Amino acid sequence: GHMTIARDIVLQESIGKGRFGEVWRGKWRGEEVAVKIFSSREERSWFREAEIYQTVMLRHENILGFIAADNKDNGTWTQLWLVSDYHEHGSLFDYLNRYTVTVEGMIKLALSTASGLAHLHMEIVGTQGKPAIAHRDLKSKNILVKKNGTCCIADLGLAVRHDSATDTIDIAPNHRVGTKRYMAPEVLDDSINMKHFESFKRADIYAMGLVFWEIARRCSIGGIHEDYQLPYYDLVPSDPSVEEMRKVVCEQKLRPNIPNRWQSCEALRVMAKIMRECWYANGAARLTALRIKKTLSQLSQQE
Numbered sequence: 001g002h003m004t005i006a007r008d009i010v011l012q013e014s015i016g017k018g019r020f021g022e023v024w025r026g027k028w029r030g031e032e033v034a035v036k037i038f039s040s041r042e043e044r045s046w047f048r049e050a051e052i053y054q055t056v057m058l059r060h061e062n063i064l065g066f067i068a069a070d071n072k073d074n075g076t077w078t079q080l081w082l083v084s085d086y087h088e089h090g091s092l093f094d095y096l097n098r099y100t101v102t103v104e105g106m107i108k109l110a111l112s113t114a115s116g117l118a119h120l121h122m123e124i125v126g127t128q129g130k131p132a133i134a135h136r137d138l139k140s141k142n143i144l145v146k147k148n149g150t151c152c153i154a155d156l157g158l159a160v161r162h163d164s165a166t167d168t169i170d171i172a173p174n175h176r177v178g179t180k181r182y183m184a185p186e187v188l189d190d191s192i193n194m195k196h197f198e199s200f201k202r203a204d205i206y207a208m209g210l211v212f213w214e215i216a217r218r219c220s221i222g223g224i225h226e227d228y229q230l231p232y233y234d235l236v237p238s239d240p241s242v243e244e245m246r247k248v249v250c251e252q253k254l255r256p257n258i259p260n261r262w263q264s265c266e267a268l269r270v271m272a273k274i275m276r277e278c279w280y281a282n283g284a285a286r287l288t289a290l291r292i293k294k295t296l297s298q299l300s301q302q303e
């Protein structure tokens with residue numbers, strides 16, 4: 001037929017891993033696609049991610065383009081597949097390690113990330129309605145960079161969907177599910193009210209603020225830039241525990257350092273102010289993704 005299906009895809013190269021599942025580059029009718037493969041015992045993880053990607057009206061330029069969920073039986077065992085668009089640059093983490101960006105490049109990455117998150121967060125009311133969705137594991141490793149230098153959000157397996165008429169969530173969430181380094185203060189200290197969907201949106205904004213800091217460090221002006229680092233590289237070990245993160249983020253109340261050279265550029269001043277306003281301990285005080293999108297759109301227009 002015309003639809004993309006697993007039996008018509010040939011795996012070519014191992015390209016990493018997801019939270020669950022192993023990622024490959026494959027070919028479908030001459031075109032490159034990305035394939036995330038799960039085992040039969042990981043069906044719940046694969047199914048939940050397939051479910052989120054199939055949400056009505058989810059598609060957006062800054063959300064990874066989902067192609068299919070399928071099974072492939074090789075004659076011995078069955079693999080569970082998720083197929084998506086393939087992006088040669090890979091993650092924002094990979095891109096920022098390999099390259100420095102211009103002021104224009106930085107705004108393009110930050111604006112596209114905020115636009116993808118605002119689309120995920122936004123409820124679309126109508127006949128073909130879209131529920132609001134919170135990611136719960138946003139980080140530079142699961143944001144991908146397209147050939148045009150814009151981002152798209154990926155790895156939606158941990159997402160939660162809201163039913164606005166009842167103020168209920170489609171799953172019963174576990175505590176502290178995501179990447180420890182990017183956990184919001186209220187997630188680290190377990191004070192987050194998980195009965196309020198808005199708490200999850202607010203936790204995603206804190207993580208997006210950390211990602212903006214990673215991008216801004218790589219913004220080169222007159223050959224001046226910082227080296228690549230993960231947020232809190234100066235305060236916690238690699239692979240930090242919840243306790244290590246909590247002591248820094250909740251108790252000492254530290255955030256990634258904003259360098260002095262970011263006050264000398266309008267674009268870096270705007271970005272630094274956005275970061276601070278994503279990093280309050282209280283989620284209710286943070287900026288929304290839609291407000292950040294408006295601010296960077298005004299900045300992109302001017303620059």
Ligand SMILES: CC(=O)Nc1cc(-c2[nH]c3c(c2-c2ccc(F)nc2)C(=O)NCC3)ccn1
Binds near residue numbers: 017018
């Ligand atoms: C060069 C290069 O890696 N390209 C590339 C990688 C991915 C990819 N990277 C990650 C994930 C996925 C991915 C793949 C298929 C799919 F269905 N959902 C997601 C993922 O799940 N988790 C984080 C890391 C997607 C597209 N292009």
